[PDB]
Design a protein around this ligand. Structure first.
Ligand SMILES: Nc1ncnc2c1ncn2[C@@H]1O[C@H](COP(=O)(O)OP(=O)(O)O)[C@@H](O)[C@H]1O
Ligand SMILES: Nc1ncnc2c1ncn2[C@@H]1O[C@H](COP(=O)(O)OP(=O)(O)O)[C@@H](O)[C@H]1O
Ligand SMILES: Nc1ncnc2c1ncn2[C@@H]1O[C@H](COP(=O)(O)OP(=O)(O)O)[C@@H](O)[C@H]1O
Ligand SMILES: [K+]
Ligand SMILES: [K+]
Ligand SMILES: [K+]
Ligand SMILES: [Mg+2]
Ligand SMILES: [Mg+2]
Ligand SMILES: [Mg+2]
Lengths: 525, 525, 525
């Protein structure tokens, strides 16, 4: 259709309008005392919320240019959260401020690339300063403590995290599940976690966690591309009985087979999940055979001349639970017999011993760790169902943030480590006087998280940031209690990965936003 | 229906509005440091691009005549890229400059024909100057260097290309495929490349490459016109089993059979591709018999009285891989047995010895080249899949640019070769005061590529081109590094074919652009 | 429904508006250097053309009456082209000019019949002078020269055409077909050409030629009216096998059978062509029997009482090729055996010897000439198929123009012959001052073809016509090469039939609407 074409600043003004609408509706919730937003529903009582994510998801703009600006900020804030694990509203504040400063520098008629260079060098130096302020969180004590902070001072969650850390390793596979009574059960079973997510988005059945969860599902151990549903009618019909789900793990499942499987899923005939087989080429068949060994199934490949029409449930591997994430399929307690798994582990271990290549050594180490270390199974015990589910979700959140704490340490939260970075980087100067202003674009806009936190708390952002500036290291301000101090002591920590990803993605979107010289959109007809 | 009939410069101005919208949205991305253009998507995250082609694709104008000008200029820029292999945004800039100058010359009330003559003679002399400055790139070292430069300083791609042309000749068939692990495998198999593409656009299944690729496909060696589906149904039914594709290599497939095949394709019943038999008349059946020999098939001709109703899989030829381009079907590793290949090669070599006509002699040489020279197969190996695919794409791009470099040599890139040409053609005069203007219309577009490149780089284009002029030969200005020097020294090269085709098609669109005295289009109701 | 009734000059102004729009869009392309017309397309790059016919075709006007004027002026231009063989733009210019001044004179109030009389007498004297100026092209030398000139300096085409007239006679049936290699093959086979075209437009399978072409077709030799499909189903079922088309050469086919056959054609079940039997009454039966003997078929007539239900392929006649034009069906190499053809020729020859009526004997000579002279087959040989097709098209064009030259001689081309005629007819006086103005209206438009040719060539029409007038006989001006001289020397020839038909049809349409005093159209709701 006919396109509405814009160039440079006419794009930038409306994109920044989208930026500012999104961030203004979002940031009113930043911090422990965020303000209320009443997001309408088509019927009945609406929802009053104090979270930036919730308001952000309900922000849409009828104008396409403002919509593009809002979306490009929203997706990059999501990127910051994803590489971060937290700080979506913090990342939104960072993004809006840095983007606004960069664009307003641009609209003066001044070089976009020099602003991008200055902001980039500022954010690199800020990452360096945050890393210097980063105190590592690697031992089990700091793991549990950060698990409490991320779980809102919930100590039992930190204990479960550390116990899984000790059982399957901190890099090991950890899953938290439903319990039976009031007892929290953590145990290690023969499992795996290979980086292969759902092939089609319609296979997800649990919106609460956003992962594919199946109870006693058969897994399709097919080492070939799936091209005809006719290969699946016997298998699908066999799975249809007894009310048990099916997992598809294969080289690839083509379009019509995916469509038929998805149709069978919403229509309630057969519940089936499809993910790609881990690895590719030579490694894919080996890892699929490892999956078969851990799950007690048979790999179906055209190399052995095995056809999917002549595929029964025995060839399909079986597990107690299989968890499929966005890009990860975790098979928990595969019914593959223990001695079979251990014999496969030993065989690939002699493969390690015969591995004369460093890449072969590393891939075989990964394979043995995944096949033998198993998965950490956490069961949530509670009196009723709701508290069980909510504490499971809290365990998930604390695990996610503690993983970032392990990866990169923690810094004093509440934006005060960012105030440290602003205080420490007052000396940064760029290759151009245009680059210099780009540096202070990232610097002042990085004390903005604390400032919006305190503003939402109803207190004064400026005196808080200034008093933190008077302090040093991890000295800061407790916004919930409206009291200053070092928030290592008063338990306000943001993992260094969180803030680093937030600032880096704010810089990335700002730099992409600076050098935007043309715009195209559809006509609003 | 009712038509919008216009004339002359009233057409030309809407033409030029289309030209200028296209070029303004496109050229902001020209050069190594192109600026960001954010292309709207109807949903979610928009697309931020720094490539002129991507922006040109999303340029549409609601008015009929502006979209008319934009479409013909976009098409001619595509022409320049196709006869060029690169410089799509460069060709767009050149076309915009020459088109605008010629149209503004016409609207003054002065003859289109003499502008055509002057522009044509200027562009001929400019091609002459570019050829004179062109340094041949035909030895292996310059081939590798140019493939490296076009592959963005990637030597291994150029080395694979050089090995492929060492194995099958530089005129031989070079193909790149997926590998198993991380190794680059180069080998030669029994295959051919005949200039016959897909019969219908809906047979393409890989939008990334825009070619029809099938794994172990059966080919329909029918030396007859295809008119009734009743001849085709048994073949399609036989192909339906085992999930293998089908290729149709015949004289012609009529509308209804092709439509039925296309229906089968999107319905997913049978994946079938149809291509025309190479050659025509007497040579077509001989080349089809060669295809059968290399694919181990049987030619089905009405001359021998063979019908497609009685056509089984045995009569169909088989190859490991068959690649169908836009106008080229390349058979790779046809199962036609090697001794059969050598026997057919010996027979056609005897025909070479018995060839008494130069046309028949050259047809026999091209047939022996296709049959026995084989195809060069380059496998791209990588640790993962995404980098595997991007390395394959970079190999394709370096192949495309290196082929042009071999064909016509290379010139100092960055737009400085055209600056050389413009400086050397300051002496050119036309046969008229008007024809002098036509020359200056063509000549002044020469610095425009460099100038847009440097402007997009955020730097000044003017004394850049001026210092290029002060320099000699290949001296110029490095745009990405913001430095001066020599392209042959600092490695910014553009094939002579690229720039020659860009300039020639800019001239051609200018000539058609100038001399148009009437319009027809539908009413905008 | 309600009608919009209009009278006289208010009709003539809408006439002339359509006339002038059509011709102004058409004539910008007249001559060897016609200007471009970018016919804006619905999608993609628009169509750029330098032909008056092409611009004429897409000239449609939203108002009923302006489109009306465009419609009959386009009609008359096509009429002059068809009765001419060339000069669609010349006819358009002449029609527009004579219509314009005739309609203006009528709107001035001067008599319609006297304007018509003066214009008619001017144009008949113009035809007289053009005939006097026409130099005949009857010799094989002039035939070859005219074929070369009309084929744009191609002597090989002229030689092939001359050989065709030398082998089958210039009144014989000449058809050009596809070649096998590079050899131009001329041969004679057994066929007739009878002035009977396809019954329905939907049977045409070659839009490029606008004639129904069938390869080895069965022909239905039914000497009866076809009203019920129930007689036609068995014939269609028999023809459907082996993928061969059917020709219906019958007395009459009513609506139901024809519609069923047409539906069968677009549905792609059976390709069917229907042609009326040549002649009427008694002669139709004899000519159908001649066709049967030519194709080895059997006449199916109700007089013998044989029906189409029991009509098999044996009763159907067979020919190697049957060409069905708009009002002509040419059967080429009918499989009717040569001795049968010669026996029928001898029988019709003795009928000639027994003929006692001049009309009867003339029909007898027509029958013997068509049956025994056969059809001439010319094969176009070329290295590639596309150049083969364009050479075949140029052969057809040179054939038509040479036939026109043989029919009415040749005149000095470039539009100088009408200049000669206008110079010679300056003395022509009418029966009235109105008829003198009627004479002057046709006289002045004579130089308009040359003037438009030279204008589009970018040169000076006035000085060209002046130097033509200063010269004598065939002295003129080369518009493409920008040179004066004798047109016979520079090989610029137009058939006298072309210009005569153009001017005569221009006068016809002008005088027709000159005498128009009422007009009705439908309301534009
Ligand atoms: N009591 C507190 N004092 C100071 N800062 C706090 C306090 N509680 C939370 N914060 C800070 O506020 C931020 C939380 O903001 P929030 O509204 O949760 O946005 P998001 O959901 O995107 O993280 C964290 O980065 C944290 O450092
Ligand atoms: N470092 C550099 N210095 C000077 N010129 C460069 C440099 N890098 C690329 N170029 C020039 O920029 C052009 C690339 O422009 P590009 O954006 O790719 O347009 P297109 O896609 O139409 O080729 C090339 O012709 C090359 O000569
Ligand atoms: N070199 C030339 N010099 C003068 N007249 C020419 C030359 N070439 C072609 N012509 C004239 O131009 C006319 C061609 O017009 P054309 O565009 O074919 O109109 P149409 O399609 O209606 O015949 C011919 O009648 C011929 O007399
Ligand atoms: K909050
Ligand atoms: K670029
Ligand atoms: K023309
Ligand atoms: Mg948070
Ligand atoms: Mg390029
Ligand atoms: Mg003509």
């Amino acid at each position: 259709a006919a396109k509405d074409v814009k160039f440079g600043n006419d794009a930038r003004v409306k994109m920044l309008r989208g930026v500012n609408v999104l961030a203004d509706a979002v940031k009113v919730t930043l911090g422990p005392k965020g303000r209320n937003v009443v997001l309408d529903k088509s019927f009945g009582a609406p929802t009053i919320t104090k979270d930036g994510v919730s308001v952000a998801r309900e922000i849409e703009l009828e104008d396409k240019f403002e919509n593009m600006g809002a979306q490009m900020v929203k997706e990059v804030a999501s990127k910051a959260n994803d590489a971060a694990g937290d700080g979506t509203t913090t990342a939104t504040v960072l993004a809006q401020a840095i983007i606004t400063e960069g664009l307003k520098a641009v609209a003066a008629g001044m070089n976009p690339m020099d602003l991008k260079r200055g902001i980039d060098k500022a954010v690199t130096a800020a990452v360096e300063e945050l890393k210097a302020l980063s105190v590592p969180c690697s031992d089990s004590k700091a793991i549990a403590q950060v698990g409490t902070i991320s779980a809102n001072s919930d100590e039992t969650v930190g204990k479960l995290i550390a116990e899984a850390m000790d059982k399957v390793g901190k890099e090991g596979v950890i899953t938290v599940e439903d319990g039976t009574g009031l007892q929290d059960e953590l145990d290690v079973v023969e499992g795996m976690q290979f980086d292969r997510g759902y092939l089609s988005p319609y296979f997800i059945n649990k919106p609460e966690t956003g992962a594919v969860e199946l109870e006693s599902p058969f897994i399709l151990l097919a080492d070939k591309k799936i091209s005809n549903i006719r290969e699946m009618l016997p298998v699908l019909e066999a799975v249809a009985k007894a009310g048990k789900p099916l997992l598809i793990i294969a080289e690839d499942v083509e379009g019509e087979a995916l469509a038929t499987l998805v149709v069978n899923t919403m229509r309630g005939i057969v519940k089936v999940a499809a993910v790609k087989a881990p690895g590719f080429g030579d490694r894919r068949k080996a890892m699929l055979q490892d999956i078969a060994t851990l799950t007690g199934g048979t790999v179906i490949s055209e190399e052995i001349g095995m056809e999917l029409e002549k595929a029964t449930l025995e060839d399909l591997g079986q597990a107690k639970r299989v968890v499929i994430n966005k890009d990860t399929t975790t098979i928990i307690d595969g019914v593959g017999e223990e001695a079979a798994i251990q014999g496969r582990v030993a065989q690939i271990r002699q493969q390690i011993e015969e591995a004369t290549s460093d890449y072969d050594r590393e891939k075989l180490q990964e394979r043995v760790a995944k096949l033998a270390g198993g998965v950490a199974v956490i069961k949530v015990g509670a009196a009723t169902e709701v508290e069980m589910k909510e504490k499971k979700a809290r365990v998930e959140d604390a695990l996610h943030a503690t993983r970032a704490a392990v990866e990169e340490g923690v810094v004093a939260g509440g934006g005060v480590a960012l105030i440290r970075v602003a205080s420490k980087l007052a000396d940064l100067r760029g290759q151009n006087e245009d680059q210099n202003v780009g540096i202070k674009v990232a610097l002042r806009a990085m004390e903005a998280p604390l400032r919006q936190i305190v503003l939402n708390c109803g207190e004064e952002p400026s005196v808080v940031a200034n008093t933190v500036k008077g302090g040093d290291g991890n000295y800061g301000y407790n916004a919930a209690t409206e009291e200053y101090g070092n928030m290592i002591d008063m338990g306000i920590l943001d993992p260094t990965k969180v803030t680093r990803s937030a600032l880096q993605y704010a810089a990335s979107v700002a730099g992409l936003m600076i050098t935007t010289e043309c715009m195209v959109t559809d006509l609003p007809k």
